[PDB]
Symmetry: C3
Subunit: 30 residues, 3 copies
Amino acid sequence: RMKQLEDKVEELLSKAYHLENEVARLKKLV
Amino acid sequence: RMKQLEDKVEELLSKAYHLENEVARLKKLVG
Amino acid sequence: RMKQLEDKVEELLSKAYHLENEVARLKKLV
């Protein structure tokens, strides 16, 4: 339910971390 | 109270997809 | 349990927003 939801928030965390490790790559390189 | 929470986890779910998408485009157009 | 899930979820809604801008400024500088 919530182990399913702290799992949702689990997936979104993983994702925003990669999304910054990249938006911050581009940013440098571009 | 689940309405709200299980609806914002939609707003962000959406947006993780757009952005994943968008970043990827940029990455491609900048090699 | 819930608050936590709404702690999480709120923060993420503000990282989320900061990144959306980021990808437009980027979008333009290209």
